[PDB]
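haha ok so turns out i had the wrong file open the whole time. this is the CORRECT one, sorry everyone. sequence first:
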Amino acid sequence: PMAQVHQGLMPTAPPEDPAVDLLKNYMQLGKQQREKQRESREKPYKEVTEDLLHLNSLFGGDQ
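then structure:
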């Protein structure tokens, strides 16, 4: 083996396999999609608190 076997044959196992990175790519777009769908328009964290400041001035509590 070694010399007259296997040698001279191209590796059928791709070391550049993009599927390994695709794991984090998919995890990435998993959150990216989430944070881009409703998070951009709605934004249930910052817009709620910001609007709450508006709401405080909205009911016009002064006296």
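The helical segments are 19-37, 46-58.
again sry for the mixup
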